[PDB]
From a paper:
2′,3′-cyclic nucleotide 3′-phosphodiesterase ([name]) comprises 4% of total myelin protein in the central nervous system (CNS), being the most abundant CNS non-compact myelin protein4. [name] consists of an N-terminal polynucleotide kinase-like domain10, a catalytic phosphodiesterase domain11, and a membrane-anchored C-terminal tail, which contains a cysteine residue that undergoes isoprenylation. The catalytic domain enables the rapid hydrolysis of nucleoside 2′,3′-cyclic phosphates to nucleoside 2′-phosphates. The [name] catalytic site, lying in a groove between two lobes, has pseudo two-fold symmetry and contains two apposing His-X-Thr-X (X denotes a hydrophobic residue) motifs, characteristic for 2H phosphoesterases 113537.
In addition to the catalytic His mutants, near-complete catalytic inactivation is evident also in T232A, [name], F235A, F235L, and Y168A. The inactivation by the T232A and [name] mutations was expected: threonine or serine is found in the catalytic motif in all 2H phosphoesterases, and in CNPcat, they are involved in all stages of catalysis, in achieving the correct substrate binding mode together with His230, His309, and the active-site water network.
Numbering used by the authors: 161 to 208, 212 to 378
Write the structure that this text describes.
């Protein structure tokens, strides 16, 4: 009997760090939905005189504690899941505390989440390229690093990281555009196709422990 891996490795925010980011995320959706910049472009958001509530729009949310996923392993069935688990840094970091840096919150017609900017030490726990996806092409590793805050009814969990990457691909091209508004936390940007990003004036710091989830 070999030992199977967790469902996925990642940094799991503490109760207070979760609550803090969880509230700020909720606030952001309430601010965006009220913002006039967003109300003009509801057409790009949903196909169907009145107003949308984004907290309700993102019904599928994390029940309790939040987290930043590193490697999806699926108990080893996923490719590269085993090679990642043998890494001394993964073994050495298992159960240790880390401080993740949130640089921005984002919203799409599919997902709501937060951008994570990992340190080098934390990037060593980031899985590398055996198959390298199309979405993260040209972007440095860990660009996908995120914390899922909300998903639309028919959106899959993988979509959050892809939505973050997609938004970051536009910023690289310089299609970020000028800020269309100013929220108390930072500048609001409209990237088109229902994509919205809040660039935090102050990098929010969260406290988490690197471990594995089993379902």
């Amino acid at each position: 009997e070999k030992d199977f891996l967790p469902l996925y490795f990642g940094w799991f925010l503490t109760k207070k760090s979760s609550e803090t980011l969880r509230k700020a995320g909720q606030v952001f959706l309430e601010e965006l939905g009220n913002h006039k910049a967003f109300k003009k472009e509801l057409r790009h958001f949903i196909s169907g005189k009145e107003k949308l509530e984004l907290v309700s729009y993102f019904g599928k949310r994390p029940p309790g504690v939040l987290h930043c996923t590193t490697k999806f392993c699926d108990y080893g069935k996923a490719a590269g899941a085993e090679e990642y688990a043998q890494q001394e840094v993964v073994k050495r970091s298992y159960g240790k505390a880390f401080k993740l840096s949130i640089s921005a919150l984002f919203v799409t017609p599919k997902t709501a989440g937060a951008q994570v900017v990992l340190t080098d030490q934390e990037l060593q726990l980031w899985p590398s390229d055996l198959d390298k996806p199309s979405a993260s092409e040209g972007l440095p590793p860990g660009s996908r690093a995120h914390v899922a805050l909300g998903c639309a009814a028919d959106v899959q969990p993988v979509q959050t990281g892809l939505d973050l990457l997609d938004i970051l691909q536009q910023v690289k091209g310089g299609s970020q555009g000028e800020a269309v508004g100013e929220l108390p936390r930072g500048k609001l940007y409209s990237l088109g196709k229902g994509r919205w990003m809040l660039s935090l004036t102050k990098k929010m710091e969260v406290k988490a422990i690197f471990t594995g989830y089993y379902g």
